[PDB]
Design a protein around this ligand. Sequence first.
Ligand SMILES: [Mg+2]
Ligand SMILES: [Mg+2]
Ligand SMILES: [Mg+2]
Ligand SMILES: [Mg+2]
Ligand SMILES: [Mg+2]
Ligand SMILES: [Mg+2]
Ligand SMILES: [Mg+2]
Ligand SMILES: [Mg+2]
Ligand SMILES: [Mg+2]
Ligand SMILES: [Mg+2]
Ligand SMILES: [Mg+2]
Ligand SMILES: [Mg+2]
Ligand SMILES: [Mg+2]
Ligand SMILES: [Mg+2]
Ligand SMILES: [Mg+2]
Ligand SMILES: [Mg+2]
Ligand SMILES: [Mg+2]
Ligand SMILES: [Mg+2]
Ligand SMILES: [Mg+2]
Ligand SMILES: [Mg+2]
Ligand SMILES: [Mg+2]
Ligand SMILES: [Mg+2]
Ligand SMILES: [Mg+2]
Ligand SMILES: [Mg+2]
Ligand SMILES: [Mg+2]
Ligand SMILES: [Mg+2]
Ligand SMILES: [Mg+2]
Ligand SMILES: [Mg+2]
Ligand SMILES: [Mg+2]
Ligand SMILES: [Mg+2]
Ligand SMILES: [Mg+2]
Ligand SMILES: [Mg+2]
Ligand SMILES: [Mg+2]
Ligand SMILES: [Mg+2]
Ligand SMILES: [Mg+2]
Ligand SMILES: [Mg+2]
Ligand SMILES: [Mg+2]
Ligand SMILES: [Mg+2]
Ligand SMILES: [Mg+2]
Ligand SMILES: [Zn+2]
Lengths: 112, 46, 50, 65, 156, 206, 98, 113
Amino acid sequence: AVPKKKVSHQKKRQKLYGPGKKQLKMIHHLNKCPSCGHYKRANTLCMYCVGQISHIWKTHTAKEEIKPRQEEELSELDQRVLYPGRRDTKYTKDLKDKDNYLERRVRTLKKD
Amino acid sequence: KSRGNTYQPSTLKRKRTFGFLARAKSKQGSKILKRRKLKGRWFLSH
Amino acid sequence: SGSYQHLSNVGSRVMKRLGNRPKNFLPHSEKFIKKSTPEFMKSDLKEVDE
Amino acid sequence: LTRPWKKYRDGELFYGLSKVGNKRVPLTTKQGNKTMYKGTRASGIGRHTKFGGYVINWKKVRTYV
Amino acid sequence: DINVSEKIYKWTKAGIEQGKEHFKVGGNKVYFPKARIILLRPNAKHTPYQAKFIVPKSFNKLDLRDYLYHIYGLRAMNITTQLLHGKFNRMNLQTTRFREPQIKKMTIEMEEPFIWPEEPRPDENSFWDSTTPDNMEKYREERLNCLGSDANKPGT
Amino acid sequence: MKVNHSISRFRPASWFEKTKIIPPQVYIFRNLEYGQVLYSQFPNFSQTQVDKLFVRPNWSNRKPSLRRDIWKCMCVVNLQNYKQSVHLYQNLCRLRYLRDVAQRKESDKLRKKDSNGHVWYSGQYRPTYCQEAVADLRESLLKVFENAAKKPSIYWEDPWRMGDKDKHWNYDVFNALGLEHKLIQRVGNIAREESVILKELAKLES
Amino acid sequence: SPGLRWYRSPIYPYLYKGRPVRALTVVRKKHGGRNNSGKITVRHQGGGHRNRTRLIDFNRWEGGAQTVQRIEYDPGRSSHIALLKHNTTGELSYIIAC
Amino acid sequence: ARTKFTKPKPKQPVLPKDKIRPPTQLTHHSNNLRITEPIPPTTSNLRCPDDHPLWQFFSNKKFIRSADDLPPSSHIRPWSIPELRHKSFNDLHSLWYNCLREQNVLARENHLL
RNA sequence: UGCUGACAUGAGUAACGAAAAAAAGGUAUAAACCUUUUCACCUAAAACAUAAGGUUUAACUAUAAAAGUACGGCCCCUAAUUAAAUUAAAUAUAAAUAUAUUUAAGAUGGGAUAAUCUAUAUUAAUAUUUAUCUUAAAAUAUAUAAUUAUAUUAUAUAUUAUAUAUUUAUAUAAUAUAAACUAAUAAAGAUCAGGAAAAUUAAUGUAUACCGUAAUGUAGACCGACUCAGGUAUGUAAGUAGAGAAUAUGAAGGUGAAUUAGAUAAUUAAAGGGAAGGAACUCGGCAAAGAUAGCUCAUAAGUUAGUCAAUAAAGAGUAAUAAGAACAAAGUUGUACAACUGUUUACU
RNA sequence: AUAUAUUUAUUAAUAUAUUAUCUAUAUUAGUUUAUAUUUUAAUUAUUAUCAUAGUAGAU
Ligand SMILES: [Mg+2]
Ligand SMILES: [Mg+2]
Ligand SMILES: [Mg+2]
Ligand SMILES: [Mg+2]
Ligand SMILES: [Mg+2]
Ligand SMILES: [Mg+2]
Ligand SMILES: [Mg+2]
Ligand SMILES: [Mg+2]
Ligand SMILES: [Mg+2]
Ligand SMILES: [Mg+2]
Ligand SMILES: [Mg+2]
Ligand SMILES: [Mg+2]
Ligand SMILES: [Mg+2]
Ligand SMILES: [Mg+2]
Ligand SMILES: [Mg+2]
Ligand SMILES: [Mg+2]
Ligand SMILES: [Mg+2]
Ligand SMILES: [Mg+2]
Ligand SMILES: [Mg+2]
Ligand SMILES: [Mg+2]
Ligand SMILES: [Mg+2]
Ligand SMILES: [Mg+2]
Ligand SMILES: [Mg+2]
Ligand SMILES: [Mg+2]
Ligand SMILES: [Mg+2]
Ligand SMILES: [Mg+2]
Ligand SMILES: [Mg+2]
Ligand SMILES: [Mg+2]
Ligand SMILES: [Mg+2]
Ligand SMILES: [Mg+2]
Ligand SMILES: [Mg+2]
Ligand SMILES: [Mg+2]
Ligand SMILES: [Mg+2]
Ligand SMILES: [Mg+2]
Ligand SMILES: [Mg+2]
Ligand SMILES: [Mg+2]
Ligand SMILES: [Mg+2]
Ligand SMILES: [Mg+2]
Ligand SMILES: [Mg+2]
Ligand SMILES: [Zn+2]
């Protein structure tokens, strides 16, 4: 149930790193994407090219934003009177800074 | 019967028992207050 | 800020304690202030008391 | 998640920084029971009625001349 | 002859007609008042015919009305009072906690409307320009809360 | 005892004719807390009226409190006949129902949304409901006059509350009628002596 | 019920089946057998039914003929009490029933 | 509970066609009603006066006095006690109220800042 | 089993706290945030109103709007009770103090008027607990005033038509569902016999103070060291079903979560089914299994006479015959001990 | 009912597409249901969810 001794430096290290099962393997199965000449996984789509195509689809197949007439044709002063500004909470501010906590996809290296 | 929740707050009761004025009014409470003052306490009572 | 502290004198004792820091822990107090301030703001000379 | 930037369990609270603190700090108007009435030195103006109403006493009302 | 509310309304109308107070003036004459009031910007819930003030915590509704009449010449017809809560604040967790001040805010209704002047641009006014102090605050946060290898990390 | 008052039921034209408490008119009430509007046949109202209107409440359109202070008269609309006023009132109720239950999605689409796709608010005050009520009032009145002497009139709390006298409120039917957009006299505490003011208005057109 | 099996109480049909005169009744303050210390001095006394003590005339001073109007149940004593009415005076009073 | 054995209940006793009263209300809401877009209240209907007494809380109708709009520190001095001592009561009272007004203007601004 | 600090080891191991998720888009930044649609879960709640509590957590600083009527406090009044208070000498007492009496405080309670809307000030003058039956009345049908069977039976409002004051008032007549529920009324059964305390006319008044109001509240926002399957007061709690607040469903509302994706060995947990046998198991039928109406009938020995035994066991009617939702309902007996309903070692 | 087309002399008739089957008032306070009035406010085929895999018979 309980360790009888302080496990030594040797014995913890040979346990962890000695076996190949536990080690990380080289990703030999990279290959060139045909659409953009960059690294991608074998039997896998290029995340750049498919992303680009998805973006294209979004730009074309776009549901139009609903802008109400009455709010679109308000005067500036009138709009200010109706819908004044406010102090956002700390939480709200944190939520707003998305680049702080949201990871954008990195581009791979160009294949040789 | 699970224990641990022996504190059951109720502001009124707290102020009656452990409030400053209750301490002031009793002789014993006044002595306590004095003792706390001597010690240097920032908060003498609830 | 979103403070409201400026329209009152609340937590007065605490403010006094903070304001009147002991002089032998003045380096401690100002070390972090120095760190906080940018190079163009901060001055080398000692901020003497009133 | 309570907040999406904190995916894992840091020792951060659901709200605020610390739950604990000095309980012994003077009451305000907002605190206490329904019966707890603090008041704000605003109205020693008139007189409370026998029935629970109030009757202003204008000789004891502040004008700013 | 007539009911109380109606009588009050009649009195108010008479006072308006006069150009005298639209309300019974008190006897406790304060010659040198030290009270200041902070005229606030209007919320979405209010109209152009309303104005809200931060006032003294010991300021009465009647007192406020009197102040508005005599100091400024404005007659507040209806007045409400909103005493705010005082949330706990502390400089740091090593310090003692205490409440921020309970602050009294009184809305008034008035017979003529009013809309604030438009707030200035960043380039125009020196003081009303939140970029600088906010940036400074951010820099302070960075520098105090920077620990190890984030010292090398470039500034925002 | 007598349980029911004038307010306790819906009152048709015949009842009004029999009684004559007030003239032919409909009262409209802003909610200072939430910005919601409350129509009524009488200058007072009860929980029953609230229940009738606020039938499908949610977080956005919460069922309002009946506390008297937050309710304030937005608009008092007078008409040529009791029957006409009753019909207008019914139309308003119908419109409200449509907005809440039947044709809710369309109403939502029409409204102003903030970022994060909610109907724009400041606190729990939502300024769209009032606007809708003004638009709904305009619609109902128009319908009444299509269906169809004293010149009718709409006593406003506030002249600002009109969208625009050019863009709206200048239909041919209204003009033919002589729809006078008056406002209530603010020479007194409007909130506190509201009932008195309403009584005075009622007296004026009789 | 097995609790009913040994419940005997004497039936008095002549006994009054109404409330006592309210002017002659004071509240019967409970103690739980606790003295001014707040400590249980007398054991085995506690939360009964609510009661009113009845002000029954033991001295019997006034004199003159008095008619017994009714005979009542009294919760604070084993005896019945009799509501007398003074024939001349008209003053009302309680008395231990014979 | 509902069971295999539960026979259904009888239908409610309807009042006959002749006996039922005609309802007091006959003609209800218009079926033609339509959800129109809202009509947002406009400042154009207002006539905010140029001498509204609430402008007295501002200074030259400015949301905020800039550094140039403010009176400079070298040019300005507070009153001396001796100077005040030879002023009349009414004058002093007026001065006090002017001071208070100025504070209010600054207080509004200061708070905003 | 020294004290304090720092850092190891177990170990990148267990665990990430009852849980239903999917796609598209915000965004070529999202398992976790927002929106839309789909799907699910709670639904006499995981809903909607509130009480208490609390680092304001809120839809936020441009912030929780009250003269009063199905608005609370404050105020008046008092209960339980409390009081360095109160009375040459109230009484007692090593001091502290204690007692009795006064006065003052003290809500968990009582408190005038009101949609026809209503007016609270000042001065003067003399209600434990339970029940709404039976009878009687008239009404509706069958038979030949009287019988039989069936509901109805005190109050709550609009309409119409009359008679009196003069379209506003008063009274009368007639018209008009069922089932729950409310308040107010009346009469009244039982012993366990049911709070306290604070006047009326007239004249003159009344410019209506202060505080509470967010959100959370069977909970991530309180008490449990934690965003803890624990503890936490009250009122509504769509319909369909039913004796019902049981049980099923779920209109609306709210929610689908600081862990995910896969795989589903051994093994564990919590479930479902099982041939032939049927307690052979085991200390012991522990556990599991077992309900051939729940309504209406009927129901023994014994016995303290109490359908106590009884919700008797078996059994009948209605329903169903191959079965085909949930929930209520789980035998009979002998002996020892204790009359019985209760109480007990909060955590063996 | 709206929108888009075709015929007809904006109207009516036809075709296609989309949305809808609500609502309000009476029956003495409230709630539900019922009927009447009001309104365009529908009844057949086939699915799904939930109730221990809802239960049961096979597999
Ligand atoms: Mg503890
Ligand atoms: Mg609170
Ligand atoms: Mg009012
Ligand atoms: Mg004894
Ligand atoms: Mg050592
Ligand atoms: Mg791992
Ligand atoms: Mg493992
Ligand atoms: Mg291991
Ligand atoms: Mg694991
Ligand atoms: Mg979990
Ligand atoms: Mg996405
Ligand atoms: Mg239900
Ligand atoms: Mg919830
Ligand atoms: Mg809630
Ligand atoms: Mg609350
Ligand atoms: Mg208030
Ligand atoms: Mg009050
Ligand atoms: Mg008192
Ligand atoms: Mg008190
Ligand atoms: Mg109370
Ligand atoms: Mg609320
Ligand atoms: Mg806590
Ligand atoms: Mg614990
Ligand atoms: Mg929990
Ligand atoms: Mg249930
Ligand atoms: Mg649903
Ligand atoms: Mg078997
Ligand atoms: Mg078998
Ligand atoms: Mg055996
Ligand atoms: Mg064996
Ligand atoms: Mg068993
Ligand atoms: Mg026998
Ligand atoms: Mg069972
Ligand atoms: Mg026993
Ligand atoms: Mg126990
Ligand atoms: Mg135990
Ligand atoms: Mg009814
Ligand atoms: Mg239809
Ligand atoms: Mg379910
Ligand atoms: Zn590519």
